[PDB]
Design a protein around this ligand. Structure first.
Ligand SMILES: [Ca+2]
Ligand SMILES: [Ca+2]
Ligand SMILES: [Ca+2]
Ligand SMILES: [Ca+2]
Length: 393
């Protein structure tokens, strides 16, 4: 099968982020410097039973315990997060959470190693109900991954969804690329604090304070949570939540900006309308050689109003449908074929550079190699189907 239009945008996106990861399945925090700390802003969407979402906004403040003079402040940047549930008890009193966190758009603490363990003590109140959780875990602070095994030890089973505590469970594990100073790793040995206010649509408000420190090679998290004004018959207090959407509900401006460039690639005459001819050059530049009818089938997926072409608003809408949906098994196979131009089953550095050029993206040779090495588990220097699929999941 001829790679689909969305597959092409996927691959383009994977390259923009220099990662064989799924680039769509993330939720974005923006970090701004501010009086020698950082301010974090984020929007998140809790899935309800019966469809629909509960939106909240998070405003976090991050302060370092180290003096101002020993810290290289970053610019403004974003962290992309993907929080997942690997295990649970029915009652949500044992919860194993996995997170992936990557800086976008670094520092090396001698104290922060490639595998770090962590331990957390959480105490708090949600609509005056008292509880306690403990956890232990580990991760790879430079690769951006971590696992936390959580227990509720008092106040359980909780009379509210566990979901509202998820973001209160690890900032040292954010992968920061070389260009971005990592305020979190630089804070040690002393560590850092945060205070967060999450405000929900329906008026529930969850505040939390957190101390991070480092005791003899293990990170120690100490967190205080005060949740209030959650509607007593709402989906939080009645446990009618199905987890956090690993996305944003509407497209951000920077998503619209990103996708406008991906559109420009196709729009060779810049008249705002894409034809089979213009899709044709792009498809052929990726090694396909499709017929007019096949190119038309591809435009038919995008062309709502039936006039044979598509414009930018229809293109955008298709990307929104894909952001609210998910990347499929077929799309992953198609994406691999595209990367693997010579069909030998191995994605090499040279292929990445040809494909990169076909899709109007530019990576340095350090970026090209890091993108491979990260996926490359057998160490032969290339990416095979199995390695690719692991990364994409
Ligand atoms: Ca055009
Ligand atoms: Ca149209
Ligand atoms: Ca190859
Ligand atoms: Ca390999």
């Amino acid at each position: 099968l001829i790679p689909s239009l969305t597959t092409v945008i996927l691959v383009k996106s994977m390259l923009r982020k220099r990662s064989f990861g799924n680039p769509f399945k993330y939720n974005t925090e923006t970090l701004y410097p501010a009086d020698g700390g950082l301010e974090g802003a984020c929007d998140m969407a809790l899935k309800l039973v019966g469809g629909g979402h509960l939106n909240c906004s998070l405003e976090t403040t991050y302060r370092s315990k180290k003096p101002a003079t020993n810290l290289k402040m970053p610019g403004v940047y974003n962290v992309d997060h993907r929080l997942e549930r690997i295990k649970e008890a029915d009652d949500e009193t044992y919860v194993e959470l996995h997170e992936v966190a990557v800086a976008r758009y670094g520092s090396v603490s001698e104290l922060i190693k490639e595998n770090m363990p962590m331990k957390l003590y959480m105490e708090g109140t949600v609509n005056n109900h008292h509880f306690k959780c403990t956890s232990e875990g580990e991760g790879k602070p430079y690769e951006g991954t971590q696992t936390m095994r959580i227990k509720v030890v008092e106040g359980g089973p909780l009379p509210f969804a566990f979901d509202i505590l998820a973001t209160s469970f690890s900032r040292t594990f954010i992968k920061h690329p070389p260009g971005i100073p990592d305020f979190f790793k630089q804070s040690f040995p002393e560590g850092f604090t945060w205070e967060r206010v999450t405000t929900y649509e329906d008026g529930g408000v969850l505040t939390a304070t957190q101390d991070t420190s480092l005791q003899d090679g293990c990170l120690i998290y100490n967190v205080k949570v005060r949740g209030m004004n959650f509607p007593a018959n709402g989906p939080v207090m009645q446990k009618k939540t199905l987890g956090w959407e690993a996305s944003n509900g509407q497209l951000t401006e920077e998503q619209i900006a990103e996708f406008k460039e991906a559109f420009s690639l196709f729009d060779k005459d810049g008249d705002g309308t894409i034809t089979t001819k213009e899709l044709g050059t792009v498809m052929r530049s990726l090694g396909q050689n499709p017929t007019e009818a096949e190119l038309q089938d591809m435009i038919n997926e995008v062309d709502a109003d039936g006039d044979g072409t598509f414009d930018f608003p229809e293109f955008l809408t298709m990307m929104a449908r894909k952001m609210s949906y998910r990347v499929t098994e077929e799309e992953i196979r198609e994406a691999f074929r595209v990367f693997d131009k010579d069909g030998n089953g191995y994605i090499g550095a040279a292929e990445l550079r040809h494909v990169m050029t076909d899709l109007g993206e530019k990576l340095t040779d350090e970026e090209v190699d890091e993108m491979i090495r990260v996926a490359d588990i057998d160490g032969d220097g290339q990416v095979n189907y199995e390695e690719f699929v692991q990364m994409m999941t």
